[PDB]
Amino acid sequence: MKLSLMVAISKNGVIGNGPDIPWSAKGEQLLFKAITYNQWLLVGRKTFESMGALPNRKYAVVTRSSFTSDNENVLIFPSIKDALTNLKKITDHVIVSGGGEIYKSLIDQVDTLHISTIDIEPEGDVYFPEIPSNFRPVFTQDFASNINYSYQIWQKG
Amino acid sequence: MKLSLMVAISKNGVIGNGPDIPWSAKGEQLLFKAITYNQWLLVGRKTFESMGALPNRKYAVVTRSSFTSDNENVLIFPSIKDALTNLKKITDHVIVSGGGEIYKSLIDQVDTLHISTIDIEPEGDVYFPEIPSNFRPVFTQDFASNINYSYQIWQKG
Ligand SMILES: NC(=O)c1ccc[n+]([C@@H]2O[C@H](COP(=O)([O-])OP(=O)(O)OC[C@H]3O[C@@H](n4cnc5c(N)ncnc54)[C@H](OP(=O)(O)O)[C@@H]3O)[C@@H](O)[C@H]2O)c1
Ligand SMILES: NC(=O)c1ccc[n+]([C@@H]2O[C@H](COP(=O)([O-])OP(=O)(O)OC[C@H]3O[C@@H](n4cnc5c(N)ncnc54)[C@H](OP(=O)(O)O)[C@@H]3O)[C@@H](O)[C@H]2O)c1
Ligand SMILES: CCc1nc(N)nc(N)c1C#CCc1cc(-c2ccncc2)ccc1OC
Ligand SMILES: CCc1nc(N)nc(N)c1C#CCc1cc(-c2ccncc2)ccc1OC
Ligand SMILES: [Ca+2]
Ligand SMILES: [Ca+2]
Ligand SMILES: [Ca+2]
């Protein structure tokens, strides 16, 4: 099973402020929607509750609480090891899609990074983890918008 | 000025049937929308007249005719050569977006390929050039849909 990771990171490393992404970069959302289309996303409970289950994708959510869902495209797991063990039974690809805790737990085990760098230095308390040294960028594309962003893909090895 | 290229190619190599793309793979057009958001697109007159000027994009349309457009996001050029001459003075990135004639003319000049391979073998009369030998794939992701597709980015090197 391949693991990808997708994130939008501002210039100071901030990805979140409380439950919110502290910016709106028009157009950036399209990258996320396009790459995650009909994919399994692995997300932490906080991100999942805040974002909700968008249509046309499937969610593996980790929680230590009794959090539940009645959406047929959502699976709730008590641990990451348990999410990954079960996902490997039904898919060959999972996209880690946040938040801070989940990115930090899994970045050493992912194969491909999708990083949109957002041209802003906002206030926030949720940061993206340091990127392991064996990752290298293989593709870059700049976008001009209300807030500028740059999309970059990284491969391990 | 960087040159990219973006195309959806069916499994037998067909990219077009008359003025149309002979398939509908749900989700694939999201990739097109995402990558071309607020970008300059170089297109041939027939593809332009057939697809129209989608919003949040700029178009450089080549024609040997006196074809005109009153769309504020559309520039018309008498040749591909003159389009490139002018585009390099007003942007740093252009995405070659079809159709067949335009792909044939520019494939040897572009830096990056965005290719969506569409899991279908349709009727059609328009094909894509052979991919130049110095291009290598650097990213791949598969998508399950009504028609499956696979997205691959190629770099020259
Ligand atoms: N900029 C971006 O691309 C982006 C993308 C996604 C999210 N974000 C931001 O990131 C912030 C949320 O991140 P966060 O780090 O606070 O929370 P989070 O990673 O989304 O979720 C944390 C929660 O996940 C559960 N969890 C974490 N590790 C677990 C484990 N090993 N086993 C079982 N459950 C586990 C716990 O749930 P319980 O509390 O239920 O026990 C924990 O409270 C938000 O601001 C969000 O907007 C930004
Ligand atoms: N599958 C995909 O991802 C994709 C994407 C785009 C298009 N397509 C397909 O491609 C097909 C249409 O392509 P096509 O090859 O027939 O036509 P085209 O490339 O879209 O347009 C050709 C026209 O461009 C102008 N032109 C070409 N070279 C020129 C030059 N050097 N200088 C000035 N003008 C030049 C001429 O316009 P004038 O006639 O006005 O002189 C020519 O008729 C359609 O079936 C469409 O669906 C597929
Ligand atoms: C679109 C940014 C984004 N970009 C990239 N490159 N990766 C990501 N992981 C996210 C993200 C995220 C998480 C996220 C997404 C949305 C969202 C709202 C409306 N349409 C789509 C998504 C809302 C809340 C949210 O977390 C509070
Ligand atoms: C989704 C196609 C597409 N997919 C891929 N992978 N590559 C491409 N090059 C194109 C293409 C094209 C041609 C094209 C398509 C649209 C379009 C219209 C309505 N919804 C989405 C797109 C607009 C203008 C345009 O050229 C003037
Ligand atoms: Ca943490
Ligand atoms: Ca770290
Ligand atoms: Ca020419």
CATH numbers and ranges of domains, chain B:
1-157 (3.40.430.10)
* Locus of tokens 């849909």: B145
A125 burial via Cβ count (<10 Å: 0-12, 13-18, 19+): exposed
Rounded Cα distance between A16 and B33, Å, is 26
- B residues 96-135 near A, CB within 8 Å? 112
Structure tokens at A68: 């539940």
Alpha carbon separation from A27 to A32, B54, B93, B151 (Å, rounded): 10, 14, 17, 20
Would you give the DSSP letter of residue A17?
B
Tell me the C-alpha distance between A4 and A27, whole Å: 21
**Determination method here?**
X-ray
Distance CA A117, CA B33 (A): 19
Q: Which of B93, B58, B88 is nearest to B76 (CA)?
A: B58
Backbone angles phi, psi at B119, to 5 degrees: -75, 70
Q: How many helices (H) and strands (E) does chain B have?
A: 4, 10
DSSP conformation letters of A120-139? -----SEEPPPPPTTEEEEE
CB A47 within 8 A of CB A63: no
Strands B2-10, B14-16: pairing is: unpaired
Note whether A93 contacts B142, CB cutoff 8 Å.
yes
3-class DSSP assignment, residue A111: coil
Query: What is d(CA A48, CA A66) in angstroms, rounded to the nearest whole number?
Result: 14
Strand, helix or coil for residue A145:
coil
Do B95 and B4 contact (CB within 8 A), yes or no? yes
DSSP structural state of residue A48:
H
Residues in chain B: 157
Contact B95, B40 (CB under 8 A): yes
CA distances (Å), B132 to each of A20, B41, B61, B106, in order? 45, 21, 24, 11
Q: Hey, is the C-beta of A3 within 8 angstroms of any chain B C-beta?
A: no
Distance in angstroms (rounded) separating the CA atoms of residues A20 and A4: 22
Q: How many Å separate Cα B69 from the centre of its chain?
A: 20
Q: Are B10 and B120 in contact (CB under 8 A)?
A: yes
Residues near ligand 5 ion, CB 5 Å cutoff: A 101, 104
At residue B57's C-alpha, the angle toward residues B83 and A20, to 5°, is: 145
CA distance B31 to chain A (A): 5
**Structure resolution in Å?**
1.9
